[model samples]
Target: GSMNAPARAAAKTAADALAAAKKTAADAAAAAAAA
Candidate 1:
């Protein structure tokens, strides 16, 4: 079984980081407004 494993992993990592960044920004905004 030979497939493009690294490329697939990189794609998933990129997507996860994008989602994490979005959540982080939303959390920061809420915290700042509450503080």
Candidate 2:
């Protein structure tokens, strides 16, 4: 089990934000060619 709460929560949020950016980037690229 882990102990830190705030850091853990922030890390999860950051991960989600990063993934969101990655998803849009893929979509933008898709407008260029088949994938």
Candidate 3:
């Protein structure tokens, strides 16, 4: 759990980037369908 820094850090960053991209797509979809 602790200090598995090498793998953990890379995965975390990748996950965060994907999350941001994914949610933005959802928001765009919301704006599209809401209109």
Candidate 4:
């Protein structure tokens, strides 16, 4: 697999957003269960 810098940068940004969202969702679920 191969891509240029612009494509790679955009991919990383999108990945970061998705990862953050996933973590937030997990944390919310855990907190709800703890309650």
Q: Which candidate is the best by lDDT?
A: 4
lDDT of 2: 0.83
The residue-by-residue lDDT of candidate 1 on 1-35, one tens digit each, is: 43587757758878899899999999899799757
The alpha-carbon lDDT assigned to residue 31 of candidate 3 equals 90
Arrange candidates, best TM-score first: 4, 3, 2, 1
Better of 1 and 3 by TM-score: 3
lDDT of 4 by residue, 1-35 (tens): 55887768868868999999999999899889757
Task: Give candidates' CA RMSD values in order.
Answer: 4.0, 3.7, 3.3, 2.7
Candidate 3 per-residue C-alpha lDDT over 1-35 given as tens digits, one digit per residue, 9 for 90 to 100: 65786858768878999999999999899899757
TM-score of 3: 0.62
- For all predicted structures, in order, the TM-scores are 0.56, 0.57, 0.62, 0.64
Runs in model 1 deviating more than 4 A are 1-10
Candidate 4 accuracy as lDDT = 0.86
Worst lDDT 10-window in candidate 3: 1-10
Q: Relative to the true structure, how large is the alpha-carbon lDDT of every model?
A: 0.83, 0.83, 0.86, 0.86
Over 4 Å off in model 4, which ranges?
Answer: 1-9
Best by TM-score: 4
**Candidate 2 lDDT tens digits, 3-23:** 588659858878999899999
Clashes of 3: 0
